[PDB]
Design a protein around this nucleic acid. Structure first.
Lengths: 108, 190, 137, 62, 204, 87, 79, 174
RNA sequence: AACGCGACGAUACUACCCGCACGUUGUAGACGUAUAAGAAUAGGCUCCGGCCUCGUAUCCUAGCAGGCGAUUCCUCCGCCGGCCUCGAAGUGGCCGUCGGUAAUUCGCGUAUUGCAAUUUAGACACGCGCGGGAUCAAAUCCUUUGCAGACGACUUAGAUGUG
């Protein structure tokens, strides 16, 4: 009875794309990491890896869970929000969904 | 101009108990007890001497220290009401139609009721219900006069104003029709 | 004539009141500039509680229950120093509840991962004893 | 003409309600309720004394 | 500290309407589920006749041909007033705005499902922390009751019952806390001095 | 017409509903509020009028009256309602 | 008035662009007319203006006036 | 306004054959930097005398600072400001630790109370009041009242602005 | 409100409830998704000693994704029942059985997924199965009625009867 958790990642929320008043740039996404509130806390996570884990209907190679991979690039603003760059831009319906921030590559 | 400090004092007589909670003020004395909330005014209460209560304000404005004046006067009015009481002496006069005033006290709600009849010969009966804690009597010292006494000056004065306002003429001449109930004397029971 | 009054009990800004700064430091008021800024000095020998003489805002400050009794207004660093070790401000600060809370926070922050595991194990033992005690009553 | 929603008219109606219709309808209701009464009287869990459970939403599903 | 929860319950008592609506709307669009209670205890800065005048102008605003469809539906409940504020602050004419409106729930009073849950508070919208002490303010409950809300008294009675139950709960909680403190002293004697000193050095 | 009887629609139900019972207080005796009947017709009567102040006072007036067949109703149930913030 | 119970039609603060321009051109025209009348100027202009003087609430007014006097005599004797 | 320090600027008309060794004027001004110091120096000399930047040179610019900026002083500022009606004299007082701080407060107070601007304000004379008797304004005078001590009622706690939700209702007492 | 809600009646197949096998079944988005006083903020809380900037708090938190056995422990969970409780859109307490359980220490197993690849693991919903219990209904068309009616619609009647 281990009765404990198994989380090795930090929770995060995909908020929106990099955008101006009208134009939006799906290349870069905005991620709010759980617990980070300033640029130094963001600087800790620049370079860390980020995964968007969702589910589809058809199983391809043993699973229905798809993943979109990316990494944290640079802090955004002063509130701890970060910019993330993925292999593919996030689906847009995912504005408000969870992203997993994994601590690798690690520098500590 | 943001005056740093302003202070004022109410002296409390030897025979009263002034219990003040956060901004609730309750005064007990021989006449009875009166309670009032002044939570709408920013003020600090303290004890400066043996029988002196200090009300104080910090970093306030001129309006704020004026409110301090108002609070001091209200608390002193409560104290003197609980010591000496408050008495309004009213007179009813008429030209042709005598005004009939009946005073009754009912067990329910513990209030007094004043019934006024035959004002300018009118067939309407005018009922005025006194606030709780104010006693009204037909006193046999002068004629056509009514004594309205109590502990709360506000209640006493408002009851007097209610009677005076309920007996007022309409569509007549102010200079010719001179009948009604008027406040003649104001003071203390003791 | 008995009056029962319980409104507030504030701590006054005054010459000799020592106040805490968000660096965790202490500084005694030596002069009052306005209702928002004062002149203060921390001459404490402890580097963690030392504060250079200067202007401090009361918004950034927090008033501790320690007051140096009779140091003159506008006293320079030497006088504030002599008053500080004469009154023993550091010992009273250490005995205050705020300093204990800060020390607990510092220990919990400096606590490592193996230390976290040992903390959990020891808390489990102490909790076994606490549950035994609570079951009886 | 005074409106049907005039304050003085409402006060007169209140007095009339309280001093005539009140007593009349009270006596009428006493008699009628008397006739109604005449016609009418013409373990906890396993007994029903303890009121237990018979047989969209307000909360978010977890 | 920017914490994510299943759903946060906000006790609307003492909160400024627009600021609480702004925070709630941002959380909804970020993906947090919110539940606001005591919208009747919400507050609006300014004076009560100012709020009542604003609501009466809102009542003026009406569609001409057929009020039944298309017309501005004037809701008289404080929960629906708060909902109107939040809806005006989010883009309700998009699927994302509709999703945020579906993460938002609002009630009058504290329903029994939420009377036993922890009610949070937002410091950025608290009246005692935001308003200058001399300024005036009004309550959305008074505004709703004066503009046509029919259920002020029922909500007041239900709140009184809930508070009596809460008083009983708090008596039980005080008894439990006394028992917990006693046990901790008794058990301390029967714990190894090493565990205690170790925990004290570690800050526990 | 009057804008108070609009949306000039057919009645949703043939029976017709009360929509408001008189307010209740515990001090009055226990009684029922409403009843039912079937319109049979209407007829003419003569009443010895006692309307003090009327010109037909202490006189015979001819009036039209409606007659409602009212067989006794049977009680077959009891419903209980609670007060909620929604009604 | 019964403004609280029955407010009237609001006075829109949404500026229209037809007027937001009229006011700009009218301001420009007013500035031009001001400059033209200042050019005309059938009224004398002097060189020295009325100096209001030193405020009397200044606590060192006596010393400043004394310095002014001594400077006057020094300049007069030197020149 | 901004960050200011005291500047003395000395300047002179360019030497000529007719008038060698010119008058060598000097004055003290308040500027964010030496560029603005020189610009307003030439502005004031153009306004007063017949010296322009083209025919003049800056002999010296020197940063003068406060002798004792760790001690509290009262300053009296006599100034001119021009509004739509004309130029007005004002004397105000500021309780600060330096002349630059006093002028900071003066510009802020002018902007807040009379909507005056930097080019609309002329600073004639800023003085350090020697004795307490020299204070004429009741606010600084109540600040220099004897045995001054006051509380701080209704202090809103400084809560981190990203701490959106809190479990305990905050207190405004300490 | 024809995309607001409630109570009650009767519900043949279907599947109406239960047990547990799952689903190459859906989800505006589990991963400890843990935490109920009320009330004031120019005051409050309490164990009556005292305490209150501060939720960077409290609980919980170790074991092949959490095995097997032992020393030792009566602690924390869980399911059923019994008594009661909760109606604002309905749940929790105590007791009882049975089931699991590092508060201390130890032994036997983890390898090879090969240097990372969502740690496919939660919830609610719906479907398809098994073996246990329960039940054997209505509406529409049609004829009829005129309390209704442009036509739909509506009030009625049609199984033996006060038809």
């Amino acid at each position: 009875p281990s009765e404990a958790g198994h989380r090795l990642y930090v929770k995060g929320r995909h908020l929106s794309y990099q955008r101006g008043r009208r134009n939006t740039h799906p290349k870069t996404s905005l991620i709010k990491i759980e617990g980070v509130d300033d640029t130094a806390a963001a600087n800790f996570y620049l370079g860390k890896r980020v995964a968007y884990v969702y589910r589809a209907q058809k199983e391809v190679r043993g699973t229905k869970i798809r993943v979109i991979w990316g990494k944290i690039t640079r802090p955004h603003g002063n509130s701890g929000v970060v910019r993330a760059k993925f292999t593919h831009p996030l689906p847009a319906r995912s504005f408000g969904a969870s992203v997993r921030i994994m601590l690798y590559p690690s520098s500590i | 101009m943001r005056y740093i400090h302003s202070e004022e004092t109410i002296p409390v007589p030897e025979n009263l108990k002034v219990s003040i909670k956060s901004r609730l003020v309750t005064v007990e004395g021989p006449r009875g007890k009166l309670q009032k909330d002044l939570s709408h005014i920013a003020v600090n209460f303290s004890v400066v001497k043996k029988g002196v209560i200090g009300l104080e304000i910090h970093h306030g404005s001129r309006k704020d220290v004026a409110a301090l004046r108002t609070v001091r006067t209200i608390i002193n009015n409560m104290i003197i009401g609980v010591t000496k009481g408050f008495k309004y002496k009213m007179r009813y006069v008429y030209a042709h139609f005598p005004i009939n005033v009946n005073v009754e006290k009912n067990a329910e709600t513990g209030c007094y009721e004043v019934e006024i009849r035959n004002f300018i010969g009118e067939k309407i009966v005018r009922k005025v219900v006194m606030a709780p804690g104010v006693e009204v009597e037909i006193s046999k010292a002068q004629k056509d006069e009514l004594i309205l006494s109590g502990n709360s000056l506000e209640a006493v004065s408002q009851s007097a104003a209610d009677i005076q306002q309920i007996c007022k003429v309409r569509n007549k001449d102010i200079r010719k029709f001179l009948d009604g109930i008027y406040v003649s004397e104001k003071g203390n029971i003791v | 004539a008995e009056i029962n009054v319980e409104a507030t009990s504030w701590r006054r800004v005054e010459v000799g009141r020592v106040l805490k700064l968000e660096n965790g430091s202490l500084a005694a008021i030596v002069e009052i500039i306005d209702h928002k800024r004062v002149l203060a000095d921390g001459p404490s020998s402890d580097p963690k509680l030392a504060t250079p003489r200067g202007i401090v805002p009361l918004s950034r400050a927090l008033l501790t229950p320690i007051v140096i009794p009779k140091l003159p207004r506008g006293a320079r660093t030497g006088a504030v120093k002599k008053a500080w070790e004469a009154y023993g401000v550091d010992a009273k600060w250490k005995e205050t509840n705020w300093a204990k809370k800060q020390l607990q926070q510092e220990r919990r922050q400096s606590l490592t991962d193996f230390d976290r595991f040992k903390v959990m194990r020891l808390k489990k033992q102490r909790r076994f004893e606490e549950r035994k005690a609570l079951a009886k009553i | 003409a005074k409106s049907a929603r005039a304050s003085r008219i409402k006060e007169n109606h209140q007095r009339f309600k309280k001093n005539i219709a009140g007593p009349v309808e009270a006596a009428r209701l006493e008699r009628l309720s008397a006739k109604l009464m005449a016609i009418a009287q013409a373990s906890g869990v396993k007994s029903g004394k303890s009121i237990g459970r018979k047989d969209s939403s307000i909360v978010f599903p977890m | 500290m920017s914490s994510f929860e299943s759903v946060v319950v906000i006790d609307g008592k003492g909160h400024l309407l627009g600021r609480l609506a702004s925070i709630v709307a941002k959380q909804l669009l970020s993906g947090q589920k919110i539940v606001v209670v005591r919208c009747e205890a919400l507050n609006i800065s300014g004076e009560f006749f100012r709020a009542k005048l604003k609501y009466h102008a809102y009542l003026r605003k009406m569609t001409r041909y057929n009020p039944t469809r298309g017309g501005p539906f004037h809701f008289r409940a404080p929960s629906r007033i708060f909902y109107k504020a939040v809806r005006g602050m989010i883009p309700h004419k998009t699927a994302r705005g509709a999703a945020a409106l579906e993460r938002l729930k609002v009630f009058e009073g504290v329903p029994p499902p939420y009377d036993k849950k922890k009610k949070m508070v937002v410091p950025q919208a608290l009246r005692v922390l935001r308003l200058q002490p001399g300024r005036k303010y009004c309550t959305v409950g008074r505004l709703s009751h004066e503009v046509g809300w029919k259920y002020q008294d029922v909500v007041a009675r239900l709140e009184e019952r809930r508070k009596a139950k809460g008083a009983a709960y708090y008596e039980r909680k005080k008894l439990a806390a006394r028992q917990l403190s006693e046990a901790k002293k008794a058990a301390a004697a029967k714990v190894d001095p090493k565990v205690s000193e170790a925990l004290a050095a570690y800050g526990y | 017409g009057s804008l108070a009887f609009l949306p000039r629609k057919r009645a949703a139900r043939h029976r017709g509903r009360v929509k408001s019972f008189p307010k209740d207080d515990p001090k009055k005796p226990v009684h029922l509020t409403a009843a039912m009947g079937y319109k049979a017709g209407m007829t003419t009567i003569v009443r010895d009028l006692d309307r003090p102040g009327a010109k037909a006072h202490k006189k015979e007036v001819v009036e039209a009256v409606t007659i409602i067949d009212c067989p006794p109703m049977v009680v077959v149930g009891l419903v209980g309602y609670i007060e909620t913030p929604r009604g | 008035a019964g403004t609280i119970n029955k407010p009237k039609k609001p006075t829109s603060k949404r500026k229209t662009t037809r007027l937001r321009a009229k006011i700009s051109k009218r301001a420009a025209e007013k500035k031009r007319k001001e400059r033209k009348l200042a050019r005309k100027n059938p009224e004398w202009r002097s060189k020295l203006k009325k100096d209001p003087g030193i405020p009397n609430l200044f606590p060192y007014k006596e010393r400043l006036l004394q310095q002014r006097e001594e400077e006057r005599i020094r300049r007069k004797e030197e020149l | 306004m901004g960050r200011l320090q005291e500047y003395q600027v000395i300047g002179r008309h360019l030497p000529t054959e007719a008038n060698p060794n010119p008058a060598l004027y000097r004055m003290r001004i308040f500027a964010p930097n030496e560029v603005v110091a020189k610009s307003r120096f030439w502005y004031f000399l153009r306004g007063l005398k017949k010296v322009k930047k083209a025919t003049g040179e800056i002999v010296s610019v020197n940063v003068i600072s406060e002798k004792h900026p760790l001690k509290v002083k009262n300053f009296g500022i006599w100034l001119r400001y021009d509004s739509r009606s004309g130029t007005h004299n004002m004397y105000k007082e500021y309780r600060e630790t330096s002349r630059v701080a006093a002028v900071e407060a003066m510009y802020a107070d002018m902007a807040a109370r009379h909507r005056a601007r930097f080019r609309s304000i002329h600073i004639l004379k800023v003085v350090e009041l020697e004795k307490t008797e020299d204070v004429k304004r009741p606010y600084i005078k109540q600040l220099v009242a004897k045995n001054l001590s006051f509380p701080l009622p209704h202090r809103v706690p400084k809560i981190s602005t990203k701490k959106i939700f809190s479990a305990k209702r905050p207190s405004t007492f300490s």
